[PDB]
Write a protein that binds this ligand. Sequence first.
Ligand SMILES: CCC1=C[C@@H]2Cc3c(c(N)c4ccc(Cl)cc4[n+]3C)[C@H](C1)C2
Ligand SMILES: CCC1=C[C@@H]2Cc3c(c(N)c4ccc(Cl)cc4[n+]3C)[C@H](C1)C2
Ligand SMILES: *[C@@H]1O[C@H](CO)[C@@H](O)[C@H](O)[C@H]1NC(C)=O
Ligand SMILES: *[C@@H]1O[C@H](CO)[C@@H](O)[C@H](O)[C@H]1NC(C)=O
Ligand SMILES: *[C@@H]1O[C@H](CO)[C@@H](O)[C@H](O)[C@H]1NC(C)=O
Ligand SMILES: *[C@@H]1O[C@H](CO)[C@@H](O)[C@H](O)[C@H]1NC(C)=O
Ligand SMILES: *[C@@H]1O[C@H](CO)[C@@H](O)[C@H](O)[C@H]1NC(C)=O
Ligand SMILES: *[C@@H]1O[C@H](CO)[C@@H](O)[C@H](O)[C@H]1NC(C)=O
Ligand SMILES: [Cl-]
Ligand SMILES: [Cl-]
Ligand SMILES: [Cl-]
Ligand SMILES: [Cl-]
Lengths: 532, 532
Amino acid sequence: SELLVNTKSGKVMGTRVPVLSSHISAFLGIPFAEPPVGNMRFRRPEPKKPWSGVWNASTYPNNCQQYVDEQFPGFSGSEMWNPNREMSEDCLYLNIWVPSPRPKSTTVMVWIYGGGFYSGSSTLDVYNGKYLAYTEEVVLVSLSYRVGAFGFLALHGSQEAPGNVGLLDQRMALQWVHDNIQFFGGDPKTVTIFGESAGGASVGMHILSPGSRDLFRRAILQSGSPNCPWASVSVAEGRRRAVELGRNLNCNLNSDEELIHCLREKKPQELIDVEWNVLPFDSIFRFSFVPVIDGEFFPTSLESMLNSGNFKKTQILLGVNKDEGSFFLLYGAPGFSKDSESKISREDFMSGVKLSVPHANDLGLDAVTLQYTDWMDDNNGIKNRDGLDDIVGDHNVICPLMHFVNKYTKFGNGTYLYFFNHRASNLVWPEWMGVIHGYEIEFVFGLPLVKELNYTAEEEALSRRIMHYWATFAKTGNPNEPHSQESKWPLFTTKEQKFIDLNTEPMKVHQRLRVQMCVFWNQFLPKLLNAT
Amino acid sequence: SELLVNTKSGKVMGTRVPVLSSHISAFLGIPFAEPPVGNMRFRRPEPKKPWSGVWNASTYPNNCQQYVDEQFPGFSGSEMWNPNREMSEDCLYLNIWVPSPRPKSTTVMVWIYGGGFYSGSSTLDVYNGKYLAYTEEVVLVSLSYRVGAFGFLALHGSQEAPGNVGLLDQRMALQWVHDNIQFFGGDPKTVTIFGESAGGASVGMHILSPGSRDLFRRAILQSGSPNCPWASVSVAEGRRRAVELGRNLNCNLNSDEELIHCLREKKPQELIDVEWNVLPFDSIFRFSFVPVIDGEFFPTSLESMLNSGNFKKTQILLGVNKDEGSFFLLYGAPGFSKDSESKISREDFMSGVKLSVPHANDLGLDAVTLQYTDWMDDNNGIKNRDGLDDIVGDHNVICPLMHFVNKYTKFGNGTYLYFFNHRASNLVWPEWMGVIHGYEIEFVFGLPLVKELNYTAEEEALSRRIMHYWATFAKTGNPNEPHSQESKWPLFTTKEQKFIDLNTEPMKVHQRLRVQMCVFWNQFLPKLLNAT
Ligand SMILES: CCC1=C[C@@H]2Cc3c(c(N)c4ccc(Cl)cc4[n+]3C)[C@H](C1)C2
Ligand SMILES: CCC1=C[C@@H]2Cc3c(c(N)c4ccc(Cl)cc4[n+]3C)[C@H](C1)C2
Ligand SMILES: *[C@@H]1O[C@H](CO)[C@@H](O)[C@H](O)[C@H]1NC(C)=O
Ligand SMILES: *[C@@H]1O[C@H](CO)[C@@H](O)[C@H](O)[C@H]1NC(C)=O
Ligand SMILES: *[C@@H]1O[C@H](CO)[C@@H](O)[C@H](O)[C@H]1NC(C)=O
Ligand SMILES: *[C@@H]1O[C@H](CO)[C@@H](O)[C@H](O)[C@H]1NC(C)=O
Ligand SMILES: *[C@@H]1O[C@H](CO)[C@@H](O)[C@H](O)[C@H]1NC(C)=O
Ligand SMILES: *[C@@H]1O[C@H](CO)[C@@H](O)[C@H](O)[C@H]1NC(C)=O
Ligand SMILES: [Cl-]
Ligand SMILES: [Cl-]
Ligand SMILES: [Cl-]
Ligand SMILES: [Cl-]
């Protein structure tokens, strides 16, 4: 009854789950698309055909096929991001947590996982929607979408592998929420999409894309934005990477149809095993199969859409973490280690700059180096390490997001900007990595509220604060409760450019988030690279 | 007897001058060249023909023909630099201060005045040699040389106006000292040349030029070095400026001979009146007629000579002032005034940047701006003012000199580097100008020892310290007296790059003078400008 819901495509039976000292309803693994398998690999998704009988929605679904990280086998800090369910191309499912008793018509929040467009799962422990749904009385949906070549192989002009199909997977889940969430007590007119990393970029892409704009009300972007340098490629570059994927697999390259036919015969792990081989440069924070600027999902270049105001005009809430780069340096740059302070030699610093800005000419590399080197103390291994950390984070996350923030706010209806700089007391990664990419997620999803996870009481309060900001913004377009006496998170405005720190200390308002480095990344360096 | 000296060119009769509570001998206005007048304008100097009788050397000579500054008529702070004697092309004379009684064979210091190669006089009150000669028991010579077009008109290929003849004037005075100073009690094997601004560049140029190297022992450079962007031009640019000088005066431009003949028939003031018209750009800290890289006085490019060690290997002592740029901004940049704090708007800041780096493309201007702009506070008029001050001083004086210092020290026999940052208690210029270009000269020449000038006791102590460093270096190649208990001024080395502050406080040693900005000026910006 409470667990038995009739949707437009058939009946679903959820399950009653414990949350803290209470319970809520969970509907796990509801299908929203036809399985994109066989001849449907690389194709746009098709709506799930209606079923008879009762869909058993008591169990998490499979995860999409993806690279699995084996750098630190058994280490919780890396394993927590890997698929925790069987991988399958049959992976287009969504999950819903519903407060008990079922509300009449409440705010909906739809989580879009990140992972560089090459990885990610809706089913990770850290994306468990039950604490947020319970604590804030929202209906929490987590969707899924194809990643890697399966979601983003792009042979523009082919209707068999057009590109962006992972984004269309997301849109079809949004369409399903629009059509069905009312049966779960959600208001389809008050849907907030939120996501981190590639999920944050995705959220921004749905803001931009005309075919997505009417399927949600407002948006939250965490450590990602649509204009990030890793988040899209041109149709020519997508085509080059798809041809090179076939070349790595001894495919007939004479035509799109012959190439696609070859790739559809391969087993999924055969594609994944060569996925990284198509990148044009030795690099970090670059991923092979990503959204393509196609003229269809994206009518024009992202920058022109941003400049002209060709995007959904609504409220947004978004921000970044203090040390976005450390994860990527640990995994891809010389001199970094999980088990040392990772003091970086001058030689390894220069190597890291080249890996971090792979598209830069020698003059551009000199500019980055000069901008981040203290020439009174150039052999300081801590300064070299932290300088590289800032380079990676500023170039790939912080400054792209600030460009988006500044462009969006000219036309939008409300911007709230945050800077998350709390390092968790129980973090398993070493201190040099600081406030790591993605480690705000556990606070957004309320994991500090769980006694057995050993967060401090101050971190529980911060998580409660963040969840309330997020859900109140989702409900009202404003993270602040009116007539409350706590300090107010101010609108980011073009003139004053205010943001807040998110940490365990009382809220502080600042202005011009990393403005000095972002003038370098957003204006001077692009002009230098264009001119040379 | 003491005042009657027979030189190789004839007899001279000096005068006995009071100095503090004692007396010394002065030989003023001794000719060292034939008057460069008539058909000898623009020509290399010729040695002064010997004279019969006794040359009356009791009176300062004429000053060379030059632009006279009328910006602040009657204001001591600017008038103190203007000619204080009649101007004439008949101006190639030198002055000698000799301790009394005459020493047997003592250290010689030869002062070379600055003034952008367009101005300067040996007779300024601030260059009065009597305090240094008396206090430190040296023979103090001040030479003169043709400035402006008269000294540096350059039509390469012509023997009538070859260029660099002002440097040859200096050389001929050095040759005269070599041949004659023994008759005044000076040791021709222990001559130190020292100079400020264009005089400091000149000193470095004699270090470089093979024809000058054997005419002095060691060298002091104050706020000037031979590689300064204002201190030389190419043969092509020198020719262009000479032809443009003729165009401004309705001259026949068909040939060097006709152009030169036209220019030789003009009154001196006619040349001076159009001197600034030949500069290629609106600019500050740029001067029309300067040394030319000719292949003779300078066998190859200054940079190749520095790189190869093609220069005199000896000891050098050199340094800069804290606020080298303020004089040039006051006189040439919008928003600066003698009678106000000169807070600079963003608009006037950008205007000043273009005036300060006139040769830079737009990308180069952006680089300079970004490097000197605090984008958290870009409308701060004080920061904008001081940022421009730093731009002018760093680009034109400090970083060229640090490049010279580093190249020289690889081959030289001892480098001593200073940073003069004491603002005189009795300065007549406003406080925003700080420690002005040229305002260390009055300390080098011992003016604070004159009670009537109202320096503090601490400034008298600083002047005496500086005079003793300069003269002890002149005598020994080391500003420090061994066996002494004074703090020691350390050698500048390639590895440690130490320098001292010169001020009224106890000595501080620092390393890497303005290294961050000078990497920008000496490595990055030239590379940006060469790419584009
Ligand atoms: C690569 C993109 C990516 C983004 C998200 C965040 C993320 C992921 C990881 N596997 C990580 C593995 C090690 C470390 Cl220290 C951080 C990670 N983090 C922060 C996945 C993959 C999800
Ligand atoms: C322009 C070159 C130049 C360098 C020397 C120092 C100098 C000179 C001036 N006329 C100055 C006029 C005003 C001020 Cl505030 C400073 C000046 N200072 C510092 C002459 C001319 C000699
Ligand atoms: C749904 O699946 C779970 C486990 O897969 C099972 O325990 C439950 O009984 C199922 N519901 C049915 C079969 O109605
Ligand atoms: C949002 O839009 C409404 C309706 O036009 C307007 O009244 C309000 O001022 C806007 N708020 C912001 C922050 O732009
Ligand atoms: C959390 O703390 C409890 C109680 O002190 C301890 O038993 C447990 O091992 C801790 N959990 C983790 C994951 O460290
Ligand atoms: C030399 O000139 C000075 C200054 O005018 C004068 O006092 C002196 O009498 C002159 N000497 C002779 C011998 O004329
Ligand atoms: C200067 O040269 C002398 C003689 O060759 C040498 O002994 C001395 O080490 C040199 N000093 C410096 C500071 O280079
Ligand atoms: C020096 O200071 C005294 C006392 O302040 C003053 O009388 C005198 O005029 C000053 N000298 C000059 C040259 O200004
Ligand atoms: Cl079924
Ligand atoms: Cl850190
Ligand atoms: Cl605004
Ligand atoms: Cl100042």
